[PDB]
């Protein structure tokens, strides 16, 4: 019987943009998705434990 899956995490700006910086400046106006992703992934990670 499987019990828990691997706890994963993602970095928003590192993936969505690259090594550039004004790309993040453009990103800042698209919304607050990063909060949603961090909250959901943290919930999954704590649910595993």
């Amino acid at each position: 019987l499987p019990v828990s899956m691997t706890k994963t995490s993602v970095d928003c700006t590192m993936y969505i943009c690259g090594d550039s910086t004004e790309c993040s400046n453009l990103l800042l106006q698209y919304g607050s998705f990063c909060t949603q992703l961090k909250r959901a992934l943290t919930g999954i990670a704590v649910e595993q434990d």
Partner: protein
């Protein structure tokens, strides 16, 4: 301050006991370099 950063992240003046993910760190570049082929021949634009 990191406590102030946590307060800003939670959007509250008081934070309960625990661990919170605030932001990300990354070391900034120190200097800059540039490399180009070793050419010193001007292109023929006057002749065109």
């Amino acid at each position: 301050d990191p406590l102030s950063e946590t307060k800003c992240t939670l959007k509250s003046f008081t934070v309960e006991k625990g661990i919170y993910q605030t932001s990300n760190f990354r070391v900034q570049p120190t200097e800059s370099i540039v490399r180009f082929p070793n050419i010193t021949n001007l292109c023929p634009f006057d002749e065109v």
